[model samples]
Target: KQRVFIAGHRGMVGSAIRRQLEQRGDVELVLRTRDELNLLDSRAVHDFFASERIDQVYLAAAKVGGIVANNTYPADFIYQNMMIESNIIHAAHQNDVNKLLFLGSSCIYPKLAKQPMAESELLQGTLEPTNEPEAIAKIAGIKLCESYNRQYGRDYRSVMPTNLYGPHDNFHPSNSHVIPALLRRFHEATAQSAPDVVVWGSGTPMREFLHVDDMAAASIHVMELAHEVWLENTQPMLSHINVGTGVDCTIRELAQTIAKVVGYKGRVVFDASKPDGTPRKLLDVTRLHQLGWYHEISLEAGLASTYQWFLENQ
Candidate 1:
């Protein structure tokens, strides 16, 4: 049986991947908590990989945060993520692990990248300022994978997933992603019978979201690609694929969807004074589609599932 290691098995993405892998059977899954294994330590990671016959690694661990956290701790964001990727990728190579997948965020694209953003648009322009450090780290992870593959003939790959939401999502008011954050706010409003729910921005900015399960399935599918087929579909130097639902809707439309999911009947208001991070951020997903993978859950279906998870977990 192949030994598969999931680096951040407790995170939203990692947990989803672990669950899927377990259901499929045959693969031996390995997990270590942050306390059990600190990935930032190169020597520790080197020792583990050197001793274990690990065949594949899912590089999912990172110091992640939302806008305020990223803005306030830019140094932390860049340094921690950089360290994690550098350590793990280097160790994986040193231990002769040929198959590895590095997970990345959509923020790696330039802020003004053509929308919907395509894999070819990476590094074409400036990144969004608020999360530039985080974006830089994500880009570094992609490059690291590409670098390993080029220099060592490894099957290392990278997948950039768009905004994801599902079970185990962070719901912190200030530190959570837009979808989970909105779910919490609207759910509260519904319970309290608040007259109105005020959302950020003018509600004109459009964004795309993918369910975490969909991302997990896509990750596995990408990892299992035949070496020759994968190379044919990707450039050796610049071959990180984007995983997202190809459709998108404005923030207003998103809020309306969330409200409906949460059963919130209040009026929705947009705060025009607040910043709308980006005008639009839909991923092209042509590469993912061509690779024979499509998201199974619709936005409405995913939103409802997320709401249920939030209620049960919180």
Candidate 2:
């Protein structure tokens, strides 16, 4: 059987990929926690690849966080993510693992990227300052994969997915992403019998979100594309594709949805003084659609399922 190793297998995105791949049962799935293997250590990663005969790799591990976390630990985000990508991509290439997929975040796009940002909009302008360091690291990961693919004729692919949420998500009040964070806030409000939950920002920032399961499916779909077909769709130096639901909603709507999912009957008050990182961020999936794949989960449904998982785990 073909051996596929998913780096960061315990992360939100990595865990989703692991579940989907296991359900398929066509490939041998290999996983290692941060304790078993340090992705930042080039020699250790190289040794692991050499010993495992890994045919494919999914580079999904990174130092990820929300606005507060990014602002608080900018250096950590940049240094750790940069090292992780450099070690993993280089080691994968060295070990002859030709087919590798590097997962990236939509934050790599410019701060003012066009509505429904496309792959072509990357690096067009400045990135959001709140997460610039993390975004830069993700950009480096994408470019590194493309560089290896060009110089070595390797099948390294990169995909920039929109905001994702699902099982295994971080629900830390100050460090988690929007979805889980909102869910947690609403749940706590209900538990405390609070009349309202105050959310950051003006609640007008528009953003897109994709279920982790859908992101995982898209990653696999891109990795499995025929070489010629993939070539025809991508330019050599600019090959990373965008994966997301083409639709988006305002932060207010998102919070309302999460509140409903968590069965919270409290009011959601937005703090107008707080910064709204991006005015809007929606991915254009025309290319993905032309390639005949689309996300299958609705926002409400996905949030409900995610809420259930959160309750079970907590």
Candidate 3:
């Protein structure tokens, strides 16, 4: 049995990967909680890798936050994330772990990047000022994987996912992403018999969202591909795969769907004066499609399922 370590098993995407891996019953899964392993500490990371004899690594650990948190603590956003990836990637190489996968964000693309951003759009222009630090760290992560693969012939792959949401997502009112924030607000409004729910922006901005479960499946599919086949589909320098459904919806449509899922019977008022950060942000999944994997969950079905989880857990 292959011994696999998932770095951030408690996180949304990491937890989804763990659930799928447990069902397979083929690999010996190794997990460490934040209390058990400090991912930011290089010496500790090196020591753990040296002793564990891990066969594969899913480098899913990261310092994630919403826009306000990221903007408020840019130093923390960049420093912690850079440290975490650098420590894990370097240590994995030192321990002779030939197979590793790094998780990156869609925000790595440039601010004015073309619609349906592709892997080649990376470093084409400037990043959004609010989260530039976080984006830079994620870009460095892709470079870290590529550098290792080029230098040592390691099978370190990277998967850059679009905005992700599902069970285990952050539900904080002010600091969570759009999906989770909407889910919580709609649920609360429904519970309290509120007349209307207010959502920010003009509600015309287009964005794409991928369920965490789908992302987990995509990550595994990319990681386990035959090395030769993987090379055939991707270039050595620009090898990270974009994971998304290649489908997008307007913010208005998204809010309406959330209301339907939450069974809320209230008017959703859009605050038009608020800032709409981007006009459109979608991932070009053409490369992912040629690689023989496609997303299984539809938007409405995924939203309904996530709402059920919120009902039971929250």
Candidate 4:
């Protein structure tokens, strides 16, 4: 069987990728828990790569969290993330592993990037203060992969996905993204017969969300492309692609959808006093669209599927 290693196999992105990959019978899926191999240690990562004889790698492991967690643990976000990316990529290269995919975030772009932020908008301005450290680390991961491709002729690719949610999402009310957070909130509200559920931020901030399954498919699609094909127009040093549905809805619309999915019958109110980090964050997926892969899952269907899983898991 083809030996394919997927680092960080327990996290949302890594687990999603594994779910997609396991459906295929061609490759042997390799996984490791932190208890088995801590990515923060350079020697351990390199030794594992040297020993595993990996044919390909999915660098999906990283330190991740929401705003409050990012703010409180900036050092962990930056330092641990940088360690994982640097260690894993370097070790893979040392082991002669050529094809690897590095997953990144849309936060790599600037806070004030143009509407429908394009891949070209990366590093154009300042990142949001809340997750700047984590963003920097993600940006570094892209840079490392690009640099490896340019100098070492390795086929290291990267994909920066927009706000993503689905199964295995962190639904913690205090420290979760918009989608899962609202799903959990409305579900609880329904359970308790609360008068109404409250949401942070104004109802106006527009955001694009992609299901994690769609993201995993895109990652596989991008990895299977020829290096020349992926860099058709972009420079080798900047070949990351933005993955999204290319559609956005306001927070109010999102909340209503969550209510519908969670079967909540109460009013949904937006707490306008809470700061809306960005007025809008929509990715211009022109490249990925041109590359012939677009998101298939609709927001309602995706939300419903996620809510069902949430219910089952809870």
Candidate 5:
């Protein structure tokens, strides 16, 4: 049996990956909670790897948040995330785990990056201030994977995915990402007949979003592909792929969709006085398509399913 440990199994990407990989009878999906295993402890991470004899690893664990949290806790976001990546990536290489995948965020790109940001867009310009520290850590992860591959001939891979939302998403009003935050507002508004729901930013910033399942699938596809093939096609240092729908919509469009999905009859308003982190971020998934993988779920359908999941769970 293939012993695969997804480091952040409780997380959306990790949980989605588990859902896809667990159904395979030949695979054993390993899991450990933060209470059980503190990834920041290098000794703990190394000891876990040494004992698990893990054959494949999905390094999905990280400290993540929206703008408010990012701006509020830049130190936590950067320090904690770097430790997690450093410990796991080093331990995986040390334990001689042959196959692994590192998950990253779209924020790795620049603030004013060209539309349809490609894998090559990484580290080309300045990151948004609110998420700069977080972005720096993620960039370090990609470099860690690439460097290990070059030095030790390992098959550690990285993929930067765009905004993601689905079942198990965070709905914390101030700390949550756009999708869940908007959903929660719309839900609460409906309950009290709230007049208008407000959103931060100018509501004109464009972004690409992926269902967590699709992001997981894309990560798995990259991990499962023959490593030799990936190397022959991609630049050695720039091996990470950008997993996105290659499509985008404005924040206004996203909020309108969320309102419709949540059945909120209130008006949607944008607070332009607030920060708009990125002007646009749509990934160029030409590499992923070339590898014969494509997303299946439509955004509308995904949103409805996510809203239903929220209803059932939250």
Candidate 6:
């Protein structure tokens, strides 16, 4: 059995990867909570890797949050994420763990990137200022993997996933992503028999979403690819793959679907007074498809399961 280590195994993406990996018979998962092993401490991270005999690493650990938190704690967002990435990637390289997958975000793309953003869109323009710190750290993460791979002939890889949701996702009413925020708001509106659920924005802006499970499966697929095959489909510097459905829907459609999934019998109102960050934000999944993986979860199906989990867990 290969000794596999999943950093940040408690996060939504990390947990999804853990769930899928748990079912396998040939994998010995190595996990550590922040209490057990502080990822911010380079010495501690190096010691852990040197002792663990880890065969592969899923570098999902990150200092992540919504815009509010990112803006409020720019220093933390940048420092902690950079520290974590540097510590883990360096330790992995030193310990000779050749295979690693670093999870990244769609926000790594340029602020005004083409409607359907591509991996090549990175660093082409300025990032959205709200989360620029976090975005910079994520970009550094991709470069970290690429640098290590270039210098050491390591198989370190990175994956940039669009907005993801499902079980274990942050359901905070104020700070969660649009999906969980809507699910919770609608669930509450249903319980209270509210007449309507007012959503922010004009509902015209488009976005893409992927279930965490689908993202996990895609991550695993990318990690398992043969070096030659991965090389054939990707340039050494542009190695990161985008994981998304390659499909998008209006914010209005998303709220309507959530209402149906949650059995909320109320009017879904779009408040035009609120700001719409982007006219459209979709990932160009050409690279991922070329690498032979596509998302399996449709928005409606994923929403239903996610709402179910919210009900059971919240």
Off by over 4 Å in 1: 273-277
TM-score of each: 0.97, 0.95, 0.98, 0.97, 0.94, 0.98
| CA error at residue 17 for candidate 1, angstroms | 0.4
User: How does each model score on lDDT?
Assistant: 0.90, 0.89, 0.92, 0.90, 0.89, 0.92
Cα lDDT of model 4 overall? 0.90
Tell me which residue pairs clash in candidate 4.
none
Model 5: lDDT equals 0.89
**Candidate 5 pairs with clashing backbones:** none
RMSD (CA, Å), each prediction: 1.2, 1.6, 1.0, 1.2, 1.7, 0.9
Candidate 6 lowest-lDDT run of ten: 169-178
Error of 2 at 111 (Å): 1.0
Over 45-68, each residue of candidate 2 has an lDDT whose tens digit, in order, gives 889988999999999999987877
Question: Can you write out model 3's per-residue Cα lDDT over 1-314, one digit (the tens) per residue?
Answer: 88999999999989999999888767899999999999998999999999999999998999888888888999999999999999999999999999999999988988899989989999999998888999999899899999999999999999999999899987766645899999999998999989999998899999999999999999999999999999999999999999999988999999999998999998999999999868899999998999999999999999999989877887
- What stretches of model 2 exceed 4 Å from their correct place? 271-278
Q: What lDDT does candidate 4 reach at residue 188?
A: 90
Q: Give per-residue lDDT, candidate 2, residue 200.
A: 80
Regions more than 4 Å wrong, model 3: none
User: Count of backbone clashes for each model?
Assistant: 0, 0, 0, 0, 0, 0
